[PDB]
């Protein structure tokens, strides 16, 4: 509740997204862009593959996701799929003491799916994931449970059965602002329309409730925050809708906002059954996936480092 | 919008509207702007602008009738005015050249210390008594509980050296604000009204420095007809003097520095 002068010493970042002197620009604190890199670092892949051997669907009692892989290569995977995931608990995390073909561990069940996740992604949505693709390190970054999940926010306390509004609060969810504070669930999870610009100058077209674009905002906020770039980045402001005016990035985000639709409404969602409570939300749910979950306030998780490229078993065949 | 005619709809009509009535009301003001001081005097130059009209594009408005307060004549505007004197000589005959203040400028009554002849009738308060009065009749008053009382503060010329002192600080029945300070000068042993507006307080040394006129000039300060109250005429009269000091009190001031 007091007037202020920036708490960051200059000079900052300087990306000219738009034509000389038009608007869309981007400013970032070097002193952060630094750490954020020196910290968002990828863990070097495992030594070369064997290339030799038969397969794994062969030798191993039960291996559906990685059946075509040579034993060795296949093992690299397990190792990776450990350090990327729970190198604190060891192999036993996704396995039973000894008997490795067991599917008596919900961790594995899903792990399995997580595989159908990554690859499917790395190969079919390369339009968003491109050549960097994704690994387990991404969402799990050295942690079994991704610190970046998102159960439909219940909202702030309820006044004697009476608090319907879901806008006014202020919650990091939205770079901080009185907004839906959960545009995700009705967007990233489900798929509520996101456009609101009236197609024609005059009226007699877009009858969208302002309140509707009022939500797009929040969403858009989060998005913009997740990657960590001002709406300038994907937009031409005056032209939040004129694609012909936007930037490449935009479209490249379009899909993304659907590859997630996918990932949530197709993978992390179903696997709720095998998932205990400690991973379920109050409204009863599965920590799905935000753009933040991977991005973690960056444009190419770990700023473009492509780990997934060094793992053949991570691509739909 | 600059080319000619392109699109066609409703709202764009209205934008024309307001942005029309504007150019109308604009004139209204223009006229209302001209009331006093009009028409102009000399031909030193012509009317700069697009359409150099006789005297202002908006035909001078009509007379306005100002019904003054109780026991007060009536004023109007416009209202022809009687030409004044020009106690000065043009440094150059060139139109737009300055006029030097013949003799002693400090009182030559010109520009830096010139002024009009406002009515010679003390402006009164709501009911009757005159607004600006000295703390004499302004006995029903009291210094702001806290602010160091100016009564007894020795004025000091802009030259620094003393120049009389003070007496009554002419308050006001309308707004408990000090507007003048009686200054029993040193050489004249008279009374010269001090225009607070020109008086800089120095509550640290009981002084009240006025970087306006040298200590001596307090002698040439237009004298007050009556000490118990001052009329508009003189209200402008005392002030205008010190004013000159701003561009007279020193050869330095008036002339450029670089």
């Amino acid at each position: 509740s007091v007037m202020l002068l920036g708490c960051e010493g200059p000079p900052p970042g300087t990306e000219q997204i738009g034509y000389r002197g038009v608007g869309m620009e981007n400013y970032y604190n070097k002193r952060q862009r630094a750490l954020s890199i020196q910290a968002n670092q990828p863990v070097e892949s495992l030594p070369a593959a064997d290339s030799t051997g038969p397969k794994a669907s062969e030798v191993y009692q039960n291996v559906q996701v990685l059946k075509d892989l040579s034993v060795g290569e296949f093992t690299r995977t397990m190792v990776a799929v450990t350090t990327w995931v729970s190198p604190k608990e060891g192999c036993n995390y996704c396995h039973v003491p000894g008997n490795w073909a067991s599917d008596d561990i919900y961790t594995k069940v899903v792990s399995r799916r997580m595989f159908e996740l990554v690859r499917a992604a790395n190969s079919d949505w390369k339009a968003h994931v491109a050549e960097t693709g994704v690994t387990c390190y991404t969402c799990h970054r050295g942690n079994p449970v991704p610190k970046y999940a998102w159960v439909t926010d219940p909202g702030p306390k309820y006044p004697s059965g009476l608090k319907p509004t879901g806008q006014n609060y202020g919650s990091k969810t939205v770079a901080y602002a009185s907004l839906p504070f959960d545009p995700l669930t009705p967007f990233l999870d489900q798929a509520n329309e996101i456009r609101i610009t009236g197609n024609a100058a005059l009226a007699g077209s877009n009858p969208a409730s302002l309140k509707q674009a009022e939500w797009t905002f929040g969403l858009m906020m989060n998005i913009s925050d997740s990657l960590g770039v001002g709406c300038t980045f994907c937009h031409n402001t005056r032209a939040f809708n004129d694609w012909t005016q936007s930037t490449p990035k935009r479209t490249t985000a379009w899909y993304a906002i659907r590859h997630v639709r996918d990932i949530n409404q197709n993978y992390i969602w179903p696997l709720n059954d095998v998932l205990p409570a400690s991973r379920k939300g109050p409204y009863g749910d599965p920590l799905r996936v935000s753009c933040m979950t991977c991005h973690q306030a960056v444009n190419k998780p770990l700023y473009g480092a492509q780990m997934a490229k060094d793992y053949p078993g991570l691509y739909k065949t | 919008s600059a080319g000619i005619t392109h699109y066609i709809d409703a709202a764009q009509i209205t934008i024309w509207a307001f942005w029309l009535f504007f150019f109308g009301l604009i004139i209204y003001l223009r006229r209302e702007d001209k009331r006093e001081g009009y028409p102009l005097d000399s031909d030193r130059t012509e009317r700069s602008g697009g359409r150099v009209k006789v005297v202002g594009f908006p035909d001078l408005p009509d007379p306005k009738t100002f019904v003054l307060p109780h026991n007060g004549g009536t004023v109007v505007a416009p209202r022809v005015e009687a030409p004044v004197a020009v106690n000065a000589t043009p440094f150059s005959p060139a139109p737009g050249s300055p006029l030097v203040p013949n003799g002693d400028p400090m009182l030559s009554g010109f520009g830096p210390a010139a002024s009009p002849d406002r009515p010679k009738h003390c402006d009164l308060t709501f009911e009757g008594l005159p607004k600006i009065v000295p703390m004499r009749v302004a006995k029903e008053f009291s210094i702001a509980e806290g602010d160091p009382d100016p009564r007894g503060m020795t004025v000091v010329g802009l030259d620094g050296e003393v120049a009389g002192t003070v007496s009554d600080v002419w308050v006001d029945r309308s707004e408990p604000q000090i507007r003048y300070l009686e200054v029993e000068v040193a050489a004249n042993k008279k009374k010269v009204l001090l225009p607070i507006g020109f008086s800089r307080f120095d509550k640290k040394a009981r002084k009240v420095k006025v970087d306006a006129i040298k200590a001596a000039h307090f002698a040439n300060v237009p004298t007050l007809s009556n000490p118990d109250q001052v009329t508009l005429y003189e209200e402008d009269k005392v002030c205008a003097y010190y004013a000159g000091g701003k561009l007279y009190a020193t050869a330095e001031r008036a002339g450029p520095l670089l």
Partner: protein
């Protein structure tokens, strides 16, 4: 400085003296700052002083 004592009857004692005192402080704060930006950022940048990048991490 042998014949530079005369400059004082012209330049006032008070104005220049503290007029420069300030000139310094603003140039002083200004310099440390201009350089720190890029050149040498002795502050948060290396060792032994590296207790944040190494420690915090």
């Amino acid at each position: 400085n042998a014949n530079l004592y005369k400059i004082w009857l012209i330049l006032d004692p008070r104005r220049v003296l503290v007029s420069i005192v300030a000139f310094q402080i603003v140039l002083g704060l200004l310099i440390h700052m201009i350089v720190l930006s890029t050149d040498l950022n002795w502050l948060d940048d290396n060792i032994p002083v590296s207790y944040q990048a190494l420690g915090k991490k």
